[PDB]
Amino acid sequence: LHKEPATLIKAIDGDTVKLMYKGQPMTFRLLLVDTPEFNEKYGPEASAFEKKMEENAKKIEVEFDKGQRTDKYGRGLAYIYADGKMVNEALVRQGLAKVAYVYKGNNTHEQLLRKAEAQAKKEKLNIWS
Numbered sequence: 559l560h561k562e563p564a565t566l567i568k569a570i571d572g573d574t575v576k577l578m579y580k581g582q583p584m585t586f587r588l589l590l591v592d593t594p595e596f597n598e599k600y601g602p603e604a605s606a607f608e609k610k611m612e613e614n615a616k617k618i619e620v621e622f623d624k625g626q627r628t629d630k631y632g633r634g635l636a637y638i639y640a641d642g643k644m645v646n647e648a649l650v651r652q653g654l655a656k657v658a659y660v661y662k663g664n665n666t667h668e669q670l671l672r673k674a675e676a677q678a679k680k681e682k683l684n685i686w687s
C-alpha cells in the first residue's frame with residue numbers, strides 16, 4: 559500500500575470526510591470502521607474526534623487498499639492519515655469506532671485495527687464503557 563496526497567475540504571462525520579484527491583472533490587468512507595451516526599450515542603464525539611484530527615493536521619494522506627476504491631455510493635474507500643497517524647486506527651483505539659465492514663481484498667489493516675479495538679475494550683473506553 560502507498561500513501562497519496564489529499565487536502566481536507568470538510569469534515570463530515572466520524573467515518574466520512576470530503577477531501578480533494580487528484581484535484582477533485584470526493585467523499586471518503588474510512589475502511590474497516592463503523593462510527594455511531596451523529597444521531598446516536600458517541601456519534602457527536604466520534605465526529606469531533608475525526609474533525610479535530612483532520613483539521614489540526616498539516617498533511618492529510620489517503621491510502622487505498624488492494625481492492626475496490628469506490629463504494630456503491632461513489633465514496634472513495636481508503637485509510638486516511640493525519641500527519642502520518644491513521645484516523646481509522648485512532649477512532650478504534652479510542653473506542654469511538656468498531657472494526658466493521660471487513661470485506662476480503664480490502665482488509666490489509668484488519669489485524670492492526672482489531673488490536674486497537676481489544677485495547678479500547680480492555681480500557682472500557684467510550685463505546686466499550
Ligand SMILES: Cc1cn([C@H]2C[C@H](OP(=O)(O)O)[C@@H](COP(=O)(O)O)O2)c(=O)[nH]c1=O
Binds near residue numbers: 587629635
Ligand atoms: C466501509 C464500507 C461500506 N460500504 C457500504 C456498505 C453499507 O451499505 P448500506 O448503505 O447498504 O448499508 C454502507 C455503510 O456505510 P455507512 O456506515 O457510512 O452507512 O456502505 C461498502 O460497500 N464498502 C466498505 O468498505
Ligand SMILES: [Ca+2]
Binds near residue numbers: 573592593594595
Ligand atoms: Ca457509520
